[PDB]
Ligand binder design. Structure first.
Ligand SMILES: CC(C)C[C@H](NC(=O)[C@H](CCc1ccccc1)NC(=O)CN1CCOCC1)C(=O)N[C@@H](Cc1ccccc1)C(=O)N[C@@H](CC(C)C)[C@@H](O)[C@H](C)CO
Lengths: 220, 238, 245, 244, 234, 233, 243, 250
């Protein structure tokens, strides 16, 4: 994977690739790694897929309960606390590296959360097998208080670096822009990789497959 | 009548009837006496018999080499408390390699016996105890009640018609501190015999003696071993 | 002030006028006990207890109603003695735990608070009955000061300059009010304590009694100790002499 | 119906034939046993608590007699009713607040604290083994966006936010006073709030307090920390009242 | 008016225990006699029907090869105690490689006395006392010994003792004929005589059971023939 | 120290009546009235939110509560019990979602909450809830209205009322209302059937309304209530 | 859990709950059983014939193992519990000990269970009595009877339930060595004893027999009608030509 | 604590359990519910108490629960307790299925629930479940089957029986028109219509007021179907056309 996050003037941009691997083989060419926590908080997941899924889902649920009882919009510190405390309670056995981004009543907040339960609040963060490349892009071309499109360009650039330089990352670039009054969950923000077009027709015509046994069963 | 059946129910007069009813259990047993000199602690117990064909009930129990007790009340509760004291003493020897100070053991008895007097469905211990012990604070006679209250005594008597024995001891307190062992046991036996009509008196068949001291571990004299104490006593009055 | 039609058989049951009669009954058990007073001077706290003697057969110092809860904290009890002792155990354990957790001697206000909460925990269920005793905690420190607190069976805890509990609670309080303990010292105070004890004592209804006394202050390095036989006999002499006027 | 009873519905927390919980009401009556009254008033830029300080003894260290409790640096409270139960509920409140901040990373809202305490009380209302607490809790504190907050919770499990409330003996009289004073619509400044509270209690008890007869908790927007007024700065308001 | 099972009477006794003592009085009467030649235990079977196999009525059982027990009252309650005794003896043998003294066994069983209660207790704990009375007759290092135990848990040694419905009368009749030097035959004879006196049915070889434990011979349950040969010299 | 009473506080009378449940219903039929109307394209819940003074802050505690993004709640009876049931219901919904990754069907939430309420009529040392619940929802295109009473029983309603004068309100709805209505119309007849027991000037702060269409559940703003309470709009 | 003493002693020394359970047994359908030389027979009376009820699903006779069968009287549900626990025990015995089970053993188990329920907290005595029947190895046929109290005995023949005293007296006056000298004669004795209390029929009587090393055999209403015909014939060929 | 205990699992002096009997009294006030066994199937028919103009009707049924692909049940008494017991029944069925990989025999399921109910009558100090149940099903051991279970934990297998309000008269009426071995599903439906007609307090009987379900064996699989209002109306109308016919002969 190759997830990143940045903080600009009006909010937060989250990025992620869409490659999921098992072994050294691509299992999913299009995997959504940017997860819904609350309507104002999203979280990118890298590492053990099922772990990132169930963890992000659980915390999303608990936050829904929380805001349901409080009647207010959830804070990012809350999701951060829940995540880090759960992850720490399991001492790293839950393979979940996370980039938590959201806009509060206190403003934009971006955390990185490692599977052992430690967190870092930074203007920009990267996680995943392609995190070094993305972090290089950030360290090279980041400036405080960027404009929205500028930050989107930066993050997509980082994720791209992860995609082309890391064998663990591949395929599309997903973005998520979160401002004080907007939520752009841009799915296929960029499709920089395309499968080559077939040069032949290997279509098998009806009858080429020999059959030993047949049984039709009507339904409704 | 509505404050009678539970140990967690205060009466409007600031009393707990179950505790007092438990206190009445001590008076149901045969009387017993305890007194100390300055070197020895002595328990003298009047054993009771159902019929003439039944042996006399044990009233003196061994706790530790330096501690013995005399019971008055429910023998089951007595055995329970006894085993508790034995266990605490063994623990003290196991941990510190020194005998458990008697006062501390008594304190533990208080703490343990206090608990069931404050919990619903529980009941007080229906037994009174006289504890004779010796440590580096001298001899000790203690008294423990079903109310979980305990007393450090110079002399004491508990049980059926023990009032006579009490009245006797209260006169000879001043003598007690300087008596030799034989005189101490004598006084104990007189106090004990005071709790009897003139038609009956002490016998080797119905008297037990427990002795502990600076020169002697806790020992129990029951039958023919009691005679050297009985033989050497006045004829008593009528 | 007297209802009892099933509404007074449990601490889990309110009276129709909003009272918990079990607690009040326990308080009445406190009232039937011999009076124990304690007074705070500018340099510590002194305790005095009217320890009634039920028999001459009992050794001196038996049934102590003055306890060492901590090396800097003393406890004076009034009422059902067994409960008082158990509460002394609870207080001791609380102080020990506090030391083992935070590394210094427990502040008196906090100890009183904790133990009081523990007591209150018994005024709420039918499974247990309220403690049948009231008690006073006394302490002194240089960084803290002289402190005296009191707790009743309900779980109420308060800080006093002078306090009394038992039969002649009010009769003792009226005598304590006469003193100016905000300026006096624990050395002078002992005499006055013994005096008030002898005054409040009823030589007619109640038989013979033994007087217990306790120091805790600057004169004892912050340690709660028993009053030496000299000072005790001195105070008793002062009291017996002051009883002839 | 209309006062009917059956079984142990007057001894434990079960339903009466008319669907009432007698033990709860009895607990409300147990609140009044203290013989005191507390008043809470919410301002435009603050929140104020005032309560009787009946110290009938010179033998009491009057500093130890308080019904005002600091739950958090920014959350204060006043308890009315049975003292021990009150202190218990205060401990529980402090725990729930500290735990809240530990788990969620931000200070607990007065709203949520009061809601929690009330939710705990409901259990006492529904379980027969224990009896509700003979006390009422009033919390005050500044909220990040909703500003000054004054909440209150009952032994019944009821909790609510208020522009003003009272608790204890002269509760109804104090409320009837406060709503009459609210309808007039004044400029709810700090002094207006404090004076309204103190005068509510005063004209409800007909006492005209000395500065050592009451205690006043307070929390401002400019100073969100729960502050307890000294005898002097209470006497200031007291002498400020006897002029107009 | 209902109360707890561990409630005290104003007299200072436990109601349930006293009621258990009252329960014993409805049981089959049994007699145990101690003799320097051995201990004997006899008990009526109280057969309520000719169809009932009398050999399935055992009120005398073997605790161990050197200890036997006679019971009176609610037998179903006694079964548990008997098994506990057997288990205790076997545990003691396993641990110490020796037999238990009769007093130790009796005490061990007596430890289950007031082991009943409601609150603050185990789920399988006893709810009520055992409505049964026991006579432990056996031979140890202190020779022949006979012990008696009641629901109170109070156990005591007896030279001769009768328990059951006809307790008092049989005890008087026992006092009239006991001297601390009887032969075992005399003890058996006396036992069967008093038994015949107190029983409502005609005493025969299938009406009762008798067993002896002697220094030289293990626990022996008297067969029909032997019973007849003792009943013979009525 | 504490444990708990292990015996039922709710038992059968010789006639065969679970008396405590009936008394609970007596508590229910005594609280503020609440109406619920299913309307083809949505559901409406409405209740009398009449405080008891000008000092009360009506914008702090609500009677119309959301369970999830598509399910809503109102009640008749005791406030605290309701609050408890709301928390529990929300939790149940979140459990269902965590397991199935699909918003819980209204009927299912109703059944589960009903089981929870049923427990307190048999479990030890507890009384039943003094609360009847009206639960609205939007699942699988169709709208849903349910009621659950203290016994743990539940019924599906086209329209109904609970609380004070629930009989008069039931006949009112039975007459002056029917199917094919739009959400607006339903809200109108809901405030109208609430007005049939409003002994006072029914303002926008005296009543609370929540709606549940196929776009989710939400509580109507006091402004929208003002527009509706103008006997029009 | 429910830590409450249910069965306690009364001031006169009675266990009221147990006695009540025995009264519940008294209301049960009459169940009798006799022991023979090579057969053993158990029969149960008033089966509450509704004729709309399946007879199989309400049988009061149940097999515990291939060796032991059992009838009961009292609360049917409690009886189901006891029966199942008994079967489980019968298997567990085979598990821990290679040998099967003796009638006395399983009887002792059931009795101990009942007693345990007479002395345990929060529980309540089983309202049943049981007639246990079997042919343990060595060939000796055995019949036992249990009681809610926990007491158990062995019998040559016995009866429990409604009017058990009547059938007990009848069996007392009719149990001879001549009677039950043959299998059919023992079965006829059971049928007669049952007819001496049942509401005069045969369609009200359920009878089953265990014999030697064979399995348990339940008698069809046809065979029962045949034996009842022979019984009604012997009551008119030896009681009509003499009276 | 000991004072507030109502002693729910205790013998009465006569040797009976009062809470069970009172629960029976509760069931006697519940909607009439009967079941009849035939040669080609088995059916349940129950009175509906949830009969109001404003009810929404969002379920397949009201008092008929599907337990297993070969089994269904009907209920009478407290409906919530009924919910508990039915859910538990489904659980048991699925456990047996998970274990033996074949459908649970009907009697085994019934006994399984009844052991729980009995357990509630013997210990725990809880009130019993105020519910009687009728079970219909098919299995490879005993084919078509009808059962009845009471809160006592007691159960029985019936060829035809009734439970609920006016159950006695319904039982005798079933005794009258019974037909051991000659019962078809159609005649059983006629019988159901008849009995439910005379027993239901509100006469005339609309299809609105009753609820009928049938379990049958069709081509290897087991079919459970709840009749639509129209079919019920057909049965009712036919019953009236058979009642006004026999009354001609006078
Ligand atoms: C194929 C998809 C649906 C999921 C894939 N699952 C898998 O690879 C799972 C792993 C299950 C597991 C068990 C115990 C402990 C840990 C993991 N494996 C299997 O399902 C089957 N195998 C069993 C034996 O043979 C090998 C695998 C996966 O997790 N891929 C991870 C990489 C990984 C890390 C650690 C352990 C196992 C796998 C991934 O894509 N991670 C991305 C982040 C996303 C998915 C949030 C990235 O990190 C990018 C793609 C780099 O991998």
């Amino acid at each position: 994977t190759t997830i990143a996050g940045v903080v600009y003037k009006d909010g937060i941009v989250l990025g992620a690739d869409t490659r999921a691997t098992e072994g050294m083989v691509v299992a999913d060419k299009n995997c959504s790694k940017i997860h819904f926590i609350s309507p104002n908080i999203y979280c990118c997941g890298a590492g053990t897929a099922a772990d990132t899924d169930m963890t992000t889902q659980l915390i999303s649920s608990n936050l829904e309960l929380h805001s349901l009882s409080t009647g207010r919009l959830p804070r990012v510190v809350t999701a951060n606390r829940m995540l880090k405390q759960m992850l720490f309670r399991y001492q790293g056995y839950i393979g979940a590296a996370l980039v938590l981004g959201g806009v509060d009543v206190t403003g934009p907040h971006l955390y990185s959360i490692y599977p052992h339960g430690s967190t870092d609040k930074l203007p920009y963060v990267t996680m995943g097998s392609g995190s070094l490349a993305a972090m290089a892009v950030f360290e090279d071309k980041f400036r405080p208080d960027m404009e929205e499109e500028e930050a989107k360009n930066l993050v997509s650039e980082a994720i791209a670096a992860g995609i082309f330089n890391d064998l663990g990352s591949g395929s599309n670039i997903d973005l998520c822009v979160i401002s004080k009054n907007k939520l752009d969950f841009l799915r296929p923000y960029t499709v920089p990789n395309k499968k080559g077009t077939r040069l032949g027709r290997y279509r098998c015509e009806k009858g080429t497959t020999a059959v030993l046994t047949e049984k039709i069963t009507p339904l409704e | 009548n509505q404050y009678d059946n539970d140990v967690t129910v205060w009466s409007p007069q600031g009393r707990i009837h179950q505790i007092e009813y438990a206190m009445e259990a001590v008076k149901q047993g045969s009387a017993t006496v305890g007194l100390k000199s300055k070197t020895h602690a002595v328990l003298v117990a009047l054993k009771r018999a159902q019929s003439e064909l039944a042996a006399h009930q044990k009233k003196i129990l061994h706790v530790d080499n330096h501690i013995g007790i005399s019971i008055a009340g429910l023998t089951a509760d007595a055995r329970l408390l006894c085993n508790f004291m034995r266990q605490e003493c063994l623990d003290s020897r196991f941990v510190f390699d020194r005998p458990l100070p008697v006062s501390r053991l008594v304190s533990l008895i208080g703490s343990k016996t206090q608990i069931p007097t404050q919990r619903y469905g529980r009941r007080p211990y229906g037994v009174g105890l006289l504890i004779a012990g010796y440590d580096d604070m001298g001899p000790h006679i203690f008294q423990t009640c079903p109310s979980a209250n305990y007393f450090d005594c110079r002399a004491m008597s508990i049980g059926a018609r023990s009032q006579s024995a009490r009245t006797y001891l209260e006169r000879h307190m001043s003598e007690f501190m300087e008596c030799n062992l034989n005189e101490l046991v004598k006084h104990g036996l007189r106090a004990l015999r005071e709790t009897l009509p003139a038609e009956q008196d002490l016998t080797t068949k119905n008297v037990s003696i427990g002795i502990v001291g600076k020169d002697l571990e806790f020992t129990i004299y029951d039958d023919d071993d009691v005679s050297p104490f009985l033989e050497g006593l006045e004829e008593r009055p009528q | 002030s007297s209802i009892g039609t099933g509404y007074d058989l449990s601490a889990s049951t309110f009276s129709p006028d909003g009272r918990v009669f079990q607690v009040e009954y326990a308080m009445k058990a406190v009232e039937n006990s011999s009076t124990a007073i304690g007074i705070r001077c500018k340099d510590g706290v002194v305790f005095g207890v009217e320890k009634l003697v039920l028999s001459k057969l009992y050794e001196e110092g038996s049934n102590k109603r003055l306890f060492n809860v901590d090396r800097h904290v003393g406890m004076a009890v009034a009422g059902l003695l067994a409960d008082a002792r158990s509460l002394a155990d609870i207080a001791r354990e609380e102080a020990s735990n506090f030391r083992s957790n935070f590394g210094y001697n427990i502040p008196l206000k906090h100890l009183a608070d904790r133990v009081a909460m523990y007591v209150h925990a018994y005024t709420l269920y039918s499974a247990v009955r309220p403690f049948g005793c009231s008690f006073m905690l006394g302490s002194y420190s240089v960084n803290d000061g002289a402190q005296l607190y009191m707790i009743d069976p309900s779980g109420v805890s308060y800080g006093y300059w002078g306090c009394a509990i038992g039969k002649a609670r009010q009769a003792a309080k009226t005598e304590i009010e006469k003193l100016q303990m905000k300026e006096m010292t624990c050395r002078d105070i002992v005499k006055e304590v013994a005096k008030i004890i002898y005054i409040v004592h009823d030589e007619v209804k109640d038989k013979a009694f033994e007087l217990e006394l306790s120091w805790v202050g600057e004169l004892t390095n912050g340690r709660h100790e028993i009053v030496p036989k000299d000072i005790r006999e001195e105070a008793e002499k002062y009291a017996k002499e002051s009883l002839k006027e | 119906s209309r006062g009917s009873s059956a079984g142990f519905d007057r001894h434990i927390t079960i339903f009466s034939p008319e669907g009432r919980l007698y033990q709860v009401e009895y607990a409300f009556k147990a609140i009044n046993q203290g013989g005191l009254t507390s008043v809470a008033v919410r301002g435009k830029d603050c929140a104020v608590i005032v309560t009787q300080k009946k110290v009938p003894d010179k033998l009491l260290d009057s500093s130890t007699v308080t019904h005002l409790f600091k739950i958090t640096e920014n959350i204060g409270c006043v308890m009315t009713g049975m003292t021990a139960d009150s202190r218990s509920q205060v401990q529980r409140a402090r725990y729930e607040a500290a735990n809240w901040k530990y788990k969620y990373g931000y200070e607990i809202p007065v709203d949520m604290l009061c809601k929690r305490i009330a939710d705990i009380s409901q259990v006492y209302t529904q379980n027969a083994e224990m009896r509700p607490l003979g006390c009422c809790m009033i919390l005050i504190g500044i909220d990040e966006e909703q500003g000054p907050q004054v909440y209150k919770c009952d032994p019944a499990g009821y909790y609510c936010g208020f522009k003003a409330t009272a608790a204890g003996v002269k509760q109804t009289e104090s409320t009837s006073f406060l709503e009459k004073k609210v309808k007039k619509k004044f400029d709810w400044t700090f002094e207006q709030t404090v004076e309204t509270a103190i005068t509510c209690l005063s004209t409800v008890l007909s006492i005209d307090f000395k500065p050592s007869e009451i205690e006043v908790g307070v929390v401002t927007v400019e100073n969100p920390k729960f502050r307890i007024l000294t005898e002097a700065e209470i006497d200031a308001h007291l002498v400020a009242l006897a002029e107009r | 008016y209902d109360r707890g099972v561990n409630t005290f009477s104003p007299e200072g006794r436990l109601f349930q225990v006293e009621y258990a003592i009252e329960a014993i009085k409805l049981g089959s009467t049994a007699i145990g006699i101690q003799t320097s030649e051995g201990v004997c235990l006899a008990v009526e079977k109280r057969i309520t029907s000719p169809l009932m196999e009398p050999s399935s009525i055992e009120k005398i059982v073997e605790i161990d090869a050197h200890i036997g027990c006679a019971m009176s009252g609610l037998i179903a309650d006694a079964k548990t105690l008997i098994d506990k005794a057997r288990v205790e003896t076997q545990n003691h043998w396993f641990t110490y490689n020796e037999t238990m003294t009769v007093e130790s066994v009796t005490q061990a069983v007596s430890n289950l006395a007031l082991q009943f209660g409601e609150e603050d207790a185990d789920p399988g704990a006893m709810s009520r006392p055992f409505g049964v009375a026991l006579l432990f007759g056996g031979v140890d290092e202190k020779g022949p010994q006979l012990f008696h135990m009641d629901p109170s848990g109070t156990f005591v040694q007896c030279d001769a003792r009768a328990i059951g419905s006809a307790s008092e009368g049989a005890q008087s009749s026992l006092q009239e004929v006991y001297h601390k030097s009887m032969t075992l035959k005399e003890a058996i004879k006396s036992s069967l005589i008093i038994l015949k006196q107190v029983m409502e049915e005609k005493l025969n070889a299938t009406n009762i059971e008798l067993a002896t434990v002697q220094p030289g011979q293990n626990f022996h349950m008297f067969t029909k023939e032997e019973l007849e040969e003792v009943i013979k010299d009525i | 120290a504490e444990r708990g009473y292990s015996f039922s506080l709710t038992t059968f009378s010789p006639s065969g009546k679970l008396v405590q449940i009936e008394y609970a219903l007596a508590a229910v039929a005594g609280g503020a009235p609440s109406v619920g109307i299913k309307a083809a394209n949505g559901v409406v819940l409405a209740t009398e939110k009449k405080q008891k003074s000008i000092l009360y802050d009506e914008r702090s505690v609500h009677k119309v509560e959301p369970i999830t993004k598509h399910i809503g709640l109102v009640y008749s009876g005791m406030g605290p019990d309701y609050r408890v049931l709301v928390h529990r219901a929300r939790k149940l919904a979140q459990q269902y979602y965590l397991v199935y990754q699909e918003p819980i069907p209204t009927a299912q939430l109703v059944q589960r909450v009903a089981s929870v309420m049923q427990e307190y009529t048999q479990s030890g040392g507890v009384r039943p809830f003094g609360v009847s619940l009206l639960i609205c929802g939007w699942n699988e295109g169709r709208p849903y209205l349910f009621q659950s009473d203290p016994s743990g029983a539940y019924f599906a309603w086209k329209a109904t009322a609970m609380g004070k004068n629930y009989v008069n309100g039931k006949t009112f709805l039975e007459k002056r209302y029917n199917e094919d209505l739009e959400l607006e119309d339903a809200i109108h007849t809901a405030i109208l059937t609430l007005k049939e027991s409003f002994e006072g000037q029914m303002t926008e702060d005296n009543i609370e309304v929540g709606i549940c269409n196929e776009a989710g559940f939400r509580r109507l703003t006091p402004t929208e209530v003002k527009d509706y309470l103008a006997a029009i709009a | 859990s429910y830590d409450r003493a249910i069965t306690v002693f009364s001031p006169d020394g009675h266990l009221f709950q147990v006695e009540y359970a025995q009264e519940a047994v008294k209301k049960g359908s009459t169940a009798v059983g006799v022991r023979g030389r090579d057969i053993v027979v158990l029969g149960v009376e008033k089966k509450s014939v509704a004729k709309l009820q399946d007879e199989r699903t309400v049988r009061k006779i149940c097999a515990l193992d291939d060796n032991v069968c059992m009838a009961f009287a009292g609360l049917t549900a409690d009886a189901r519990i006891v029966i199942n626990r008994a079967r489980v025990e019968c298997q567990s015995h085979r598990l821990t000990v290679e040998d099967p089970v003796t009638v006395e053993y399983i009887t002792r188990y059931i009795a101990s269970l009942k007693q345990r329920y007479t002395q345990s907290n929060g529980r309540r005595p089983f309202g049943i009595s049981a007639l246990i029947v079997g042919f343990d190895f060595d060939g000796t046929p055995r019949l036992y009877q249990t009681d809610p109290s926990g007491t158990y005995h062995a019998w040559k023949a016995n009866a429990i339930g409604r009017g058990a005293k009547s059938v007990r007296e009848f069996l007392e006056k009719n149990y001879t060595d001549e009677a039950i000298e043959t299998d059919d004669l023992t079965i006829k004795l059971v049928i007669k004893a049952l007819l001496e209390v049942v509401q005069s029929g045969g369609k009200n009587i359920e009878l089953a027999v265990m014999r030697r090393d064979q399995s348990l055999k339940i008698l069809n209403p046809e065979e029962i009608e045949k034996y009842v015909a022979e019984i009604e014939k012997e009551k008119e060929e030896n009681e009509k030509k003499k009276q | 604590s000991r004072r507030y205990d109502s002693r729910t699992t205790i013998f009465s002096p006569e040797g009976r359990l009062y809470q069970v009997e009172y629960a029976m009294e509760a069931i006697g006030h519940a909607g009439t519910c009967l079941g009849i066994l035939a040669n080609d199937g088995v059916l349940l028919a129950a009175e509906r108490r949830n009969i109001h103009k404003l009810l929404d009707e969002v379920f397949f049924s009201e008092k008929i629960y599907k337990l297993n692909e070969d089994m269904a049940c009907s209920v009478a008494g407290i409906t919530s307790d009924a919910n508990v017991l039915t859910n538990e029944l489904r659980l048991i069925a699925q456990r047996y299925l998970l274990q033996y990989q074949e459908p649970i025999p009907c009697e085994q399921l019934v006994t399984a629930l009844c052991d729980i109910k009995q357990a509630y009558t013997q210990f725990g100090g809880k009130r019993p479940f105020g519910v009687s149940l009728l079970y219909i099903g098919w299995d490879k051991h005993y084919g078509f089957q009808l059962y009845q279970s009471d809160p006592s934990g007691n159960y029985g297998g019936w060829k035809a029986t009734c439970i609920g309000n006016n159950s006695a008269a319904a039982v005798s009426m079933l005794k009258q028109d019974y037909k051991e071995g000659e019962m078809t599903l159609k005649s059983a439906l006629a019988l159901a219509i008849k009995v439910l007609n005379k027993t239901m307090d509100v006469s005339k009987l609309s299809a609105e007021k009753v609820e009928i379900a049938t379990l049958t064996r069709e081509n290897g699989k087991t079919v459970i179907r709840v009749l639509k209002q129209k079919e019920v109306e057909q049965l009712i109308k036919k019953h009236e056309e058979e009642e006004a016919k026999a009354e001609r002969e006078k």
